[PDB]
C-alpha cells in the first residue's frame, strides 16, 4: 500500500458505465478479461478490474506485489475499492492495448516494424528482469499481457498470478496452456517458467502469429521450433510478410534467444539477464 488511491464502488461504478461488459467496439466498456473495464476518471482515462475469504487475499496480494514492483516496463496500479462488496484494481491505462492485438492488426492498426518489435522486446524483457531481480514469478506471460502505452513502450500487466520466489509446488495449477513451460503444467513454481513463455511470445513477434490457432498446423506456435530444427523449414519461411525492414541477421539473432527460452529442461534455458543481454546484442 504505496500510497495508492482508495475508491468507492459508486464511483467507479459510475465511470465504467455501470460496469458495461459488452466489448468496447460494441459499444460497452470491457476491454479484456475479474474482467477488466474502461472507465473515465478526473481528465483520465483508466482501466478498471472487477471464494469470498480468499479473493480478498488475492486482491491483498496483487496490491503487495504493486506496491512493492514500480517499473517504466510494469503497469502501475492507480488504486482500489473495497467497500461495494466486490472488489476493483485500477491502473494507468494504455491507449495502444496489448502486444497480442497489435501483432494480429485488431480493428485495422498498421502492422508493427521490425525496429518497434525489437523495442517492444527488449522493453518486456527489463520488465520482466525487474520481476526476478525483485524475488517475483509473474506466472501468466504471454503477449495478451504486454501492454503498449502511448510510445508503445511494453509494459508488463496481469499480475493476478504473481508469486514471490526465495523451486515451489503448487496443487492449483494456473496460466495459459499455449505459453506453459512443462514444469509449470506440472505445477512447479519457477521463474525459469516466465523465461519460457517470454520464448513463445518472441516467436509471435517474429511470425505475428498466435500461440495457439485450432485451425492451424502446428495448432501450437511452440512447434515450429521442432520443424525448423529438423531442418524441414527455416524461421525465414516463418517471418511476418507484414513488415519491410526485417534484416536476416537480426530476426536471427531473436529466433535464437527464443530458442533457448524454449528448451524443455528448466535449467538448460537462459536466466533473464542473459536473455536481456542477447537482446541488446541483437539491436
Same mark, same amino acid.
Request: negative net charge.
Given at each position: 500500500d504505496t500510497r495508492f488511491h482508495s475508491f468507492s464502488f459508486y464511483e467507479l461504478k459510475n465511470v465504467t458505465n455501470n460496469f458495461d461488459e459488452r466489448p468496447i467496439s460494441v459499444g #460497452? *466498456?470491457? @476491454? #479484456?478479461? #475479474?474482467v477488466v473495464y474502461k472507465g473515465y476518471v478526473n481528465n483520465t482515462t483508466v482501466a478498471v478490474k472487477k471464494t469470498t475469504e480468499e479473493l480478498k487475499q488475492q486482491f491483498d496480494q496483487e496490491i503487495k506485489v504493486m506496491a512493492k514492483c514500480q517499473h517504466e516496463n510494469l503497469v502501475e496500479l492507480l488504486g482500489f475499492s473495497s467497500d461495494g462488496d466486490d472488489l476493483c484494481l485500477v491502473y494507468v491505462y494504455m491507449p495502444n492495448g496489448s502486444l497480442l492485438d497489435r501483432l494480429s492488426c485488431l480493428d485495422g492498426t498498421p502492422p508493427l516494424s521490425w525496429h518497434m518489435r525489437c523495442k517492444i522486446a527488449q522493453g518486456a524483457a527489463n520488465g520482466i528482469n525487474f520481476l526476478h531481480e525483485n524475488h517475483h514469478i509473474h506466472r501468466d506471460i504471454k503477449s495478451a499481457n504486454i501492454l503498449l502505452d502511448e510510445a508503445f513502450t511494453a509494459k508488463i500487466s496481469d499480475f493476478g498470478l504473481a508469486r514471490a520466489s526465495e523451486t515451489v509446488m503448487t496443487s492449483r495449477i494456473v496460466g495459459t496452456t499455449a505459453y506453459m513451460a512443462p514444469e509449470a503444467l506440472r505445477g512447479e513454481i519457477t521463474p525459469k517458467s516466465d523465461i519460457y513463455s517470454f520464448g513463445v511470445v518472441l516467436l509471435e513477434i517474429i511470425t505475428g502469429l498466435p500461440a495457439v490457432d485450432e485451425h492451424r498446423e502446428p495448432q501450437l506456435l511452440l512447434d515450429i521450433k521442432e520443424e525448423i530444427e529438423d531442418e524441414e523449414k527455416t524461421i525465414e519461411d516463418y517471418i /511476418?510478410?507484414? @513488415? *519491410? /525492414?526485417?534484416?536476416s541477421t537480426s530476426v536471427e539473432a531473436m529466433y535464437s534467444v527464443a530458442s533457448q527460452c524454449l528448451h524443455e529442461k528448466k535449467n538448460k534455458r537462459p536466466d533473464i539477464k542473459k536473455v536481456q543481454q542477447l537482446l541488446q546484442e541483437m539491436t
Open positions: #460497452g *466498456n470491457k @476491454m #479484456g478479461e #475479474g /511476418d510478410k507484414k @513488415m *519491410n /525492414d526485417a534484416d
